[PDB]
Structure formats: C-alpha cells, structure tokens
Amino acid sequence: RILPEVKVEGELGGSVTIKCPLPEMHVRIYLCREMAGSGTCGTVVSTTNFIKAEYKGRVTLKQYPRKNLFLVEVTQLTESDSGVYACGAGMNTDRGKTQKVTL
Amino acid sequence: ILPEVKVEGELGGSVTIKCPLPEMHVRIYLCREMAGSGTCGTVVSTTNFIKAEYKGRVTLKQYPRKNLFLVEVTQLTESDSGVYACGAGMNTDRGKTQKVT
Amino acid sequence: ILPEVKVEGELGGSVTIKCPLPEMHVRIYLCREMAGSGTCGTVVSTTNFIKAEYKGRVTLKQYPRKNLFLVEVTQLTESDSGVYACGAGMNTDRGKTQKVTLNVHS
Amino acid sequence: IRVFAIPPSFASIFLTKSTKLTCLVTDLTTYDSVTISWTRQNGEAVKTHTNISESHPNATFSAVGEASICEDDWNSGERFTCTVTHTDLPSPLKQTISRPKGVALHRPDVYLLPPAREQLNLRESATITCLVTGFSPADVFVQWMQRGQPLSPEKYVTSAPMPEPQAPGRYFAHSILTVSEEEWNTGETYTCVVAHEALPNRVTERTVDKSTGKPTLYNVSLVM
Amino acid sequence: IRVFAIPPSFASIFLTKSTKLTCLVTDLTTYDSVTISWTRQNGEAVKTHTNISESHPNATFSAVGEASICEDDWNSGERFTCTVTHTDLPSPLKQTISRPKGVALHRPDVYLLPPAREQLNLRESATITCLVTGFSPADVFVQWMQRGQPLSPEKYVTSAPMPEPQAPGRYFAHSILTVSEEEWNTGETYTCVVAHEALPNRVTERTVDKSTGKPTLYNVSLVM
Amino acid sequence: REQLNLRESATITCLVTGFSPADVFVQWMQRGQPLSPEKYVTSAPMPEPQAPGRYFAHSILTVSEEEWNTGETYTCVVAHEALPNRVTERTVDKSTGKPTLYNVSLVMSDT
Amino acid sequence: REQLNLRESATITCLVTGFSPADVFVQWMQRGQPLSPEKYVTSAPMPEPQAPGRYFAHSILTVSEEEWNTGETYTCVVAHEALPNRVTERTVDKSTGKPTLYNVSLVMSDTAGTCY
Ligand SMILES: CC(=O)N[C@@H]1[C@@H](O)[C@H](O)[C@@H](CO)O[C@H]1O
Ligand SMILES: *[C@@H]1O[C@H](CO)[C@@H](O)[C@H](O)[C@H]1NC(C)=O
Ligand SMILES: *[C@@H]1O[C@H](CO)[C@@H](O)[C@H](O)[C@H]1NC(C)=O
Ligand SMILES: *[C@@H]1O[C@H](CO)[C@@H](O)[C@H](O)[C@H]1NC(C)=O
Ligand SMILES: *[C@@H]1O[C@H](CO)[C@@H](O)[C@H](O)[C@H]1NC(C)=O
C-alpha cells in the first residue's frame, strides 16, 4: 500500500503530475478516485478511452515502459477535494489498486 | 461538493444562492435538512411548493444561458442557517447535487 | 426551537414561561422532562391537572391574539427546576414545541 | 318571476342540526325587503328574510329568504308547501317539495389510504384519501377530523358521488386531504368523518397514520 | 343565440384515435333546413355533417353537427367555423373553435394506491386507486390494463377532474379499478395508463403489485 | 396505554363481577397501607349482563403515572360474604403483563 | 426475469463491445458442441456512442425456459484479430448469479417435541 502524496498546491493554476508504478504486462491501468464514502474508487482515466466528466479535457496519460511508470497529468487542476487517487491495473478496479495518491 | 456559499446575516437582509441547473428540464429544488428526521426537506421546487415557514419570503429564478437556479430568501428572520441542498429529480432526498450552508 | 430563558428565583417571585399558542386548541401543557427515566412529566396542561408538588402555585393564561400561552409559577418554592417544554397535542412526550432551560438559583 | 326550490341537504342538516327549506325567485330585480313567502303544509312555518343585496351585476338580483322546521320533518317524507310572495313578482303562488323516498339504504364502507411512497419521496406534500363505498341515498358528507377537531374546509376536496361499477344502486366518493410531508412523517393520525343516512348512528370515523401499515409483532431492520 | 359546439376531448381523441368535429347544438331549434357547414377558419368548408341525425327540435339539435376531421392541426392548430342557416334564420349562426388554446400544460403525476388492509381483510373485494394530480390543462384519459391487456371499462370508473386545492390551476382525478381479493393476493400487474397532452409522449403508466411495498431483501413469516 | 400516552393520570380499575347478594366493599392499598378515599371511587352494584343472579361493580383509582411508570404495587382488596375468607386481593404493576421481548440480532454476511 | 416468468422461452445475450476493427465473429457453444447457426442471431457491428473508433455487436441465443432451468452452460465464443488467442469464451448458467441465501429461522416458545 505505497502512499505517495503529490500534494500539488498550485490550486487553480496548478497542473498536477503523478507517476504511478506500471507492471508493463499490457494490462489496462486506471487512476481511481475514492467516491464519497462508497469505497469503490471511480476511475478518472484508464488505458480504456474512458475519461470522467469532471476530469475530462484536463486529464492526460503518458507512458514510460523503460522507466516502468505511467504519468497522469491534471492540467487545469482546479480544486476538487482530492481523496486517495489510487492508480492500479487490472480489469477489476477497486481490487487491483496498488499506489494511493493524495492531492 | 459542499460549497456553502452564503452564511450571510441580517434580520431583514436578502440572501441569493446560485444553484446548479442541469437543464434536462428536470425538477430543480432548494431543500433543507432536518436534524430530527435526518432527511432533507423541500422548501422550494419547480413544482410550486412553498414551505410553511417560508410562505412568500423565498423566490426562485431560472437562467438557462448561465445555467443558474437562484434562490432568494428576501426576509431572513434569522432562523437557523440550515445546511441547504440543491438537487434535481423527483427524489428530493437522494437527488441532491450541492450543499449550501 | 429552544428559546431557553433562565429566570430569577424568589420565594414569592412569579417566574413566567412563554409558550406558543398554535390556535389548534389541543391540550397545551408544560413538561418537566425526567432525564433519568427519559420520559416527559407534565406539571400543568390545558386540562385542570396540576402536578402534585406544583399544586396551588402554577397558573396558565391564553392569548390567541398574541399567539401566546402564559405559564406563571406565582409561588416559587425554588425546588429542582429542570428543563421545561411548552407543548401541544394529546401526546405529551412527542408534543413538545419549545424547550426552555431555566435555573432559579440565579 | 322564476320559481326555484332548493331542498335541504344532508350536509346542512348535519352541520347546523336544523333542516332549512329553501325557495328562491329569479328574473326579478330587488325592490325592497327581498324575500320569499314561507309556509309549511299547514302554513305555520312563516319565517323571516335574509341575504339582502341591493342588485345583481345586471341589477336583477334574486331575492333570498329562509324558513326553518324540525330536522326530522324533512326525513318524515311528508310534502312541505312554501308560499312565494314578493313585491316584484306579479302574482304570488306556492310550491311543494319533499325528500324523495323509496330509496335503498346501504351502509357506507370507509377506507383510508395513505400517500404513496413516491409522493412522500418528493417531500413536498402528501394526499391521504378517504374512500367511501356502497352508500346510496346518494348522499355523504365527509369531513376531516385530526388532532381532535376539524380542519379548514379548503384543505380537503370531496368528489361528487358517482355510481359504482359493479353495484348499481351503491355509489362512492373520494375525499383527498393534502398535508405537508413532515406532519405525516412525524406521526399524526388524521381522522376522516363520513356522515351519512344509512349509518347506524349516522357518523363513522376512521384513523390512519404512519404506523398503521407497519406490522406490530415482528420488527426486522436491515443494517449496513 | 349561438351554435353550441362539442369540441373533441383528448380522452375522445385518444380513445377514438381521430377527431370528431362537432357542432350539434345543445339547446337550439331544429325545425328543418339547419345546415351545418364545417368550415375551416380559411373558409374552406371541408366535410360537413355527414351522417346527420333526425329533424327533431327537442329544445336542442337532434340532427348532428358531427363530422370527422384530422387532428394534427385539425383539432389543434387553427379553428373550425360552423355556420348554421336555419329555415327561420336569415343570418346564419356561425362559430369557430380553437380547442380552447392558451392553457398552461402540466405533466400529471400518477400514484397507484393499493387496496386498504381492512378491505382485503373483509375479503369481499378490493379497489386499486390511480390518483392523478398536478395536471395543467385539465383533460386526462385514464385506463387500466393487466399484463398488457386493456381491461373492460365496466370494472373501473374514473372521476372527472376537479381543481386541486393547494395549486389553483392544477387538477386531480381518481380512477379506481375494483378487483377481487383473490385476484389481488396473487400477483397481478394492474397497470394504470394515463393519456394526457402534457405528458412526455402523452402516455405514462405505473403498476402496483401485492408485493409492491414489501421490502424485497427479507421474506419474514410467522408460523403458528 | 392510550392515556399513559399523556402523563396526567392513570386510572386503574378493579372489575368485581359475578357475585351475589349484591354488596361488596372494595378498597385499595399501596404497600399494605390503605389509600385515602378521595383517590378512588367505586361504582354501585349493577345486575349482570348475561347471568341473572350475579352482579358486577367497578372501582377506579386515579393515580398519576409518575407513581405508575415507576412501578407501584397498587393492590385492590375486595370484601364480600361469599368469599371463603370474606376477603380477596389482586395486584398490578407497571410490569404485570409484559410478554418476553425476543430481540435477536444476526450478523451473518461475513460468511 | 420476465421471460422466465412467461416460461415460453428465454434470450441469452452476448454483448461484444469495444473492439476497434469492425469485423468480429461470435458463435455459441453448448457442452463443447457448437450450436446450429439458426438458433443464435448476431447483430452487425455498429459504432459505439461513447467510443469513436470502437464498435459493438450483440448476439442472442434463444433457448427454452426449461433448458435454462436445467442449469446449462451456454458459452459464447468470440473471434477477433485483437484477441490474444484470436478467441475468448464466456460462460453463464442458471447458477451464475445467486449469492447464498441465509434462511434464518427463529424457533421460540414452540413445541412438536421435534428433536433439535
Ligand atoms: C416459512 C418460510 O418462510 N420459509 C420458506 C419456505 O416456506 C419455503 O418452502 C422455502 C423455499 O421457498 O424456504 C423459505 O423461503
Ligand atoms: C422497528 O424497526 C425500525 C427499523 O429502523 C426501528 O427504527 C425501530 O426502532 C423498531 N421498533 C422498535 C420498538 O425498536
Ligand atoms: C415467502 O416466499 C414464499 C415462496 O413461495 C411465498 O409463498 C410467501 O408468501 C413469502 N412470504 C410472504 C410473507 O409473502
Ligand atoms: C429454508 O428452506 C428450507 C428448504 O425448503 C425450508 O423447508 C425450510 O422450512 C426453510 N427454513 C425455514 C424453516 O425457515
Ligand atoms: C437439517 O436438514 C436436513 C435436510 O435433509 C434435515 O433432514 C435435518 O432434520 C435438519 N436438521 C435438523 C436438526 O432438523
């Protein structure tokens, strides 16, 4: 349960970039967003073409196979009380999370 | 989201709260949570319901271009700043969108 | 609503309790909440009942024009005065409308 | 000039407990002391005028008078003959009316249906409906009695009786009471009171609240 | 002195599936030569009264003014003139009807209230209620159905609309369909289908089952 | 239970039924010591509904639920000629009925 | 549940979604034996609403309600270029969903002598 906390404090002007670990086993990834007391992290972005409504347009994904990392960037990054932004791989979302990320 | 925008305060002041208006023509309402029941109670709605305590003192306004539902409490008899809730749909309790203490 | 009013304590002082008058004409009462048991206990109501150790000291007045119901304890014996509740309705426990926390020590 | 006979209704003889024969004159303008003459079958019921108005919007207001007799007299079935004498009308006359007899009596069956869960979900208002079935002097007076006594007549709406589907003689009516959700949610009893002829002692009361539907023996609560 | 017209109702429109432009005059004279010209507002007299009834002035037109126009804007849209020449009328009595347009269109809100517990306990019968509240222009058409089969109109009767107390403009109505208790205790859909102009696609039904309130997640039973 | 939803006064009744020659002396005691007569009022004997030769009578005691909720004994003692000891007694408490409250609570979804 | 209640038949649907090349092939197998092509009808690939370059296509197998009750297998095998082994198989029977029902009883003051 590795817990990087990027904590980019740029607020409206900030553009948070988080690099989560990556298996590189061609499995899909996702950036979870722990939904308000549900416990089921909802995916912000993934290898699948899905991007959330709220995080659309500003969230982008970039690959580092040789560095074994996946970099997710929220460019606009306008304030939205960031909860554990877990990044994990696998078809299952909540179970497959690896690294927690707090913003 | 809990952007309680107005804790404004006056015996005869008027507070205007902007409310997210989804526009799919759904019923949009201003709601009030009650501690005893634990369930939010409607005070204003697109359907012409005006709560017993707020008869004639609260008004609703629509801006589709701006996507704003403004609720205006014109006479605050300084009764308890409640944790008010914007929501949509025909289920007041679970349809809340934003909180506005 | 709890417009609690702590009142002065005198042997002959007539402490006054303000109560809402819903005009509904149901039994309007003042409740001495019994915290240990967790249930209400009425000291006086619209009916001619008065509590045993409150007999001959408490009286009630109606004023519909002012939406007001007066409970005046003309002879205060400065006894254990806990929280009082102005209430209406046949049920007394549930019925409370106004909660007044008063201490006659001061 | 135009003779109208308004018989007493069961609602009036229930509310005031004194039956009130009505006769009226139309197509005439109000000269002075507007009224309709009053007699019974024996002519003893000579009563006084009421509802004086200067003129109609068209200055041809209908003169109004009233007469009083014992309540059981109307239900006795005997014909009652009220005269018609007014200064405006050219010639006085008299009319006779009575309660229409020979009409089956079936006891009303009263049910109280609480508001549907969806209506409570809206959290705006809630309609408690008093359904009265199987009554056929075609008359019913339904009112609402909560917390001891009478709610404002504006709150509840009672539909006119309408002839049933299966039973030909027996009718029905519905009386909806619209109250805010919090009183219902709280717990509040709301009675419904069907005053009717065919009733044993003419009045039937029913009570519904939030806890009527819930079973009393078992109490199963699912917790997460 | 005007030609009374009976505009088709949305209930009549939906049940008939077509409009029946009608100027059969309630309260007129029908001596002879009483031509109904179902003219349009543009002066085009289309089909007038075809299949008109007999010449009988029973203080009304026995002869009909009914036709069969085309709904879409031929009921709505414009207005339809009916110019009636009598055998005693030099100036033909004419009248156009725009289906009283200008009203405020609200969507009905439908709640199915299941039969009361006391009614089921009596086991004689049961009455399901379809409360329709909140409509704008007051002209709803309610039917009942069961598993997609429209039930016969004999066993359900629905009250006419009547001014809602809380909301001045809005109306309410009741359609009660009366079953058999042994039909209710077994699962039966008993859908209520409301056809109103202001509903989404003019129709919306809501069903109720004997198992419609029961909590689903746990089947509590008492064995004695 | 309806009037105890009100906190004023609880009325406890001592229905004396099916006796004869109709004259019974009914009084009340709390904890063995007779209550003041202004607390309770007893009805005069009245012929029975069903049975002919018997009679029936009532006696209500107006207490106040502070003494009731808080469980007193409030016994009713009835004196009549036909009783073997000429005297009988009955007792009631706030808890003289109360069927057992089965309150199970299973948590089983862990399986 | 409605089709099962009607008891006349049942329609199992294989929903293939998200495959970028248009061409795909779905076939339905039972007990390892491919079913006759008449029974299952497969839709032509149609573009997905929220996926621009990815398509979707259903496939419906109509079977008798009794066969569904006699808890069968019905796998649905899909063939595409993008798949690892060029085919993937998904199986659902009558007991695929059910989640263990606790039938909790509560004998209280009752008799019958019945031993426990
Ligand atoms: C008494 C009770 O509620 N238990 C039922 C039982 O009647 C039924 O036979 C079986 C399967 O339906 O298990 C329970 O659902
Ligand atoms: C009955 O069940 C409800 C379910 O929430 C519970 O709140 C209530 O306390 C129960 N009644 C009693 C007397 O415990
Ligand atoms: C529980 O399920 C059985 C299944 O047949 C049904 O018959 C019974 O009515 C259900 N219990 C209740 C209380 O409806
Ligand atoms: C649980 O299900 C069994 C299986 O049919 C049934 O017979 C038994 O009575 C049910 N359990 C009880 C008694 O609740
Ligand atoms: C448990 O279930 C079986 C079903 O075969 C039944 O025979 C047995 O009696 C049950 N146990 C008890 C203690 O009754």
Curated annotation (Swiss-Prot), chain C:
Keywords: Cell membrane, Disulfide bond, Endosome, Golgi apparatus, Immunity, Immunoglobulin domain, Lysosome, Membrane, Phosphoprotein, Receptor, Secreted, Signal, Transmembrane, Transmembrane helix. It comes from Homo sapiens (Human). This is Immunoglobulin mu Fc receptor. The modification Phosphothreonine is found at T74. Induction: Regulated by circulating IgM levels and immune cell activation signaling. Down-regulated in activated T cells, effector memory and central memory T cells, as well as in activated NK cells. Transcriptionally down-regulated upon TLR9 signaling. Down-regulated in response to IL7 and IL15. Down-regulated in old age. The gene is FCMR. Residues 22-27 are annotated as: CDR1. The keyword Disulfide bond applies. One of its GO terms (molecular function) is IgM binding. The chain holds residues 19 to 124 of 390 of the full protein. Changing R94A: Displays reduced interaction with IgM. Disulfide bonds join C19-C86, C31-C40.
Curated annotation (Swiss-Prot), chains D, E:
Glycans are attached at N51, N58. Residues 8-98, 108-209 form the Ig-like domain. Disulfide bonds join C23-C82, C130-C192. Keywords: Adaptive immunity, Cell membrane, Disulfide bond, Glycoprotein, Immunity, Immunoglobulin, Immunoglobulin domain, Membrane, Secreted, Transmembrane, Transmembrane helix. One of its GO terms (molecular function) is antigen binding. Residues 103-212 are annotated as: CH4. Residues 1-102 are annotated as: CH3. Signal peptide: none annotated. GO terms for biological process: adaptive immune response; antibacterial humoral response; B cell receptor signaling pathway; defense response to Gram-negative bacterium; innate immune response; pre-B cell allelic exclusion. N-glycosylated; important for IgM secretion and its localization at the plasma membrane. The interaction with FCMR is glycan-independent. One of its GO terms (cellular component) is plasma membrane. Constant region of immunoglobulin heavy chains. Immunoglobulins, also known as antibodies, are membrane-bound or secreted glycoproteins produced by B lymphocytes. In the recognition phase of humoral immunity, the membrane-bound immunoglobulins serve as receptors which, upon binding of a specific antigen, trigger the clonal expansion and differentiation of B lymphocytes into immunoglobulins-secreting plasma cells. Secreted immunoglobulins mediate the effector phase of humoral immunity, which results in the elimination of bound antigens. It is linked to Agammaglobulinemia 1, autosomal recessive: A primary immunodeficiency characterized by profoundly low or absent serum antibodies and low or absent circulating B cells due to an early block of B-cell development. Affected individuals develop severe infections in the first years of life. This is Immunoglobulin heavy constant mu. It comes from Homo sapiens. The gene is IGHM. The chain holds residues 222 to 433 of 474 of the full protein.
Curated annotation (Swiss-Prot), chain G:
Changing T73A: Has little effect on IgM BCR assembly. Keywords: Adaptive immunity, Cell membrane, Disulfide bond, Glycoprotein, Immunity, Immunoglobulin, Immunoglobulin domain, Membrane, Secreted, Transmembrane, Transmembrane helix. Residues 1-93 form the Ig-like domain. GO terms for cellular component: blood microparticle; cell surface; extracellular exosome; extracellular space; hexameric IgM immunoglobulin complex; IgM B cell receptor complex; IgM immunoglobulin complex; pentameric IgM immunoglobulin complex. One of its GO terms (biological process) is pre-B cell allelic exclusion. Disulfide bonds join C14-C76. It comes from the Eukaryota. Residues 1-96 are annotated as: CH4. GO terms for molecular function: antigen binding. N-glycosylated; important for IgM secretion and its localization at the plasma membrane. The interaction with FCMR is glycan-independent. The keyword Cell membrane applies. Constant region of immunoglobulin heavy chains. Immunoglobulins, also known as antibodies, are membrane-bound or secreted glycoproteins produced by B lymphocytes. In the recognition phase of humoral immunity, the membrane-bound immunoglobulins serve as receptors which, upon binding of a specific antigen, trigger the clonal expansion and differentiation of B lymphocytes into immunoglobulins-secreting plasma cells. Secreted immunoglobulins mediate the effector phase of humoral immunity, which results in the elimination of bound antigens. It is linked to Agammaglobulinemia 1, autosomal recessive: A primary immunodeficiency characterized by profoundly low or absent serum antibodies and low or absent circulating B cells due to an early block of B-cell development. Affected individuals develop severe infections in the first years of life. This is Immunoglobulin heavy constant mu. The gene is IGHM. The chain holds residues 338 to 455 of 474 of the full protein.
